[PDB]
C-alpha cells in the first residue's frame, strides 16, 4: 500500500428510502491510470466491496456494483473533476457503514476486496429505520 491523495465525502444520515451521493477524489495520473472503486465497512462486520470503474480505456470505462446494491448505487467518473462518484438512491437499514474509496491495476482486483493504497478516513453512513408519517 502507498500513501495517494484520498478526499472522501458524501456521507450523512438519512431514513431508510432516502438518498446520498458519495464523491472520492484523487490526483489526476492516478485517476484515470487505476480502477477506482468504493468499498464499506459496517460495525461489527469484514470491509467489504461495494461498487468499482475499471481503468480508462482510450475513450471510455465500464462499471460493476456489489449485487446487494444492483439498482440502487450507480458508480461513474466525471473525468473534469477527478472524481468517483457513488449515487445510493434507496437507501437501507443494512448499507449504514463507513464507506472507501481505493484504487487497483485492475477491477478484477477490487472486486475481490483487493486495494493498494492506503485508505483514508471514509465517509460515515447512517441509515436509519424511517421517519415521522404526515
Known amino acids: 500500500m502507498a500513501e495517494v491523495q484520498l478526499v472522501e465525502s458524501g456521507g450523512g444520515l438519512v431514513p431508510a428510502g432516502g438518498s446520498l451521493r458519495l464523491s472520492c477524489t484523487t490526483s489526476?495520473?492516478?485517476?484515470?491510470?487505476?480502477?477506482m472503486g468504493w468499498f464499506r465497512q459496517a460495525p461489527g462486520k469484514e470491509r467489504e466491496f461495494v461498487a468499482a470503474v475499471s481503468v480508462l480505456s482510450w475513450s471510455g470505462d465500464s462499471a460493476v456494483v456489489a449485487d446487494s446494491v444492483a439498482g440502487r448505487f450507480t458508480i461513474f467518473r466525471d473525468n473534469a473533476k477527478n472524481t468517483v462518484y457513488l449515487q445510493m438512491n434507496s437507501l437501507k437499514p443494512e448499507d449504514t457503514a463507513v464507506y472507501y474509496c481505493?484504487?487497483?491495476?485492475?477491477?478484477?482486483?477490487?472486486?475481490?476486496?483487493?486495494?493498494?493504497?492506503?485508505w483514508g478516513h471514509g465517509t460515515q453512513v447512517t441509515v436509519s429505520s424511517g421517519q415521522a408519517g404526515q
Open positions: 489526476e495520473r492516478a485517476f484515470r491510470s487505476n480502477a
Open positions: 481505493n484504487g487497483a491495476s485492475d477491477i478484477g482486483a477490487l472486486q475481490s476486496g483487493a486495494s493498494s493504497w492506503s
